């Protein structure tokens, strides 16, 4: 967390509903609708994990 690697998306297919569908999730954050609604969206910037 003190020195993470950096990334951003490149017009890729953001099927964001996978954050609710995959079993591995153990923490979350929000400032809008659920992950399936994030799969119903797009943005001109995409700074990413």
């Amino acid at each position: 967390v003190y020195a993470w690697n950096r990334k951003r998306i490149s017009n890729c297919v953001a099927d964001y509903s996978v954050l609710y569908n995959s079993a591995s999730f153990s923490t979350f954050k929000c400032y809008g609708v659920s992950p399936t609604k994030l799969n119903d969206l797009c943005f001109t910037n995409v700074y990413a994990d």
């Binding site: 609710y20 569908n21 979350f28 929000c30 609708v33 659920s34 609604k37």
Partner: protein, 49 residues
């Protein structure tokens, strides 16, 4: 902290159409059905004036 307003609803309300209802809404995949959890919420929360 007494002044409640509505953060979640199943649909937008109509002109002059008042609504007191307090039903939990499920934006997340879990049918939480009367309690909160992953993206499931009690619809009224309050200002901290």
């Amino acid at each position: 902290y007494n002044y409640r307003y509505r953060l979640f609803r199943k649909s937008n309300l109509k002109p002059f159409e008042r609504d007191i209802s307090t039903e939990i809404y499920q934006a997340g995949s879990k049918p939480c059905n009367g309690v909160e959890g992953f993206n499931c919420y009690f619809p009224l929360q309050s200002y901290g004036f």
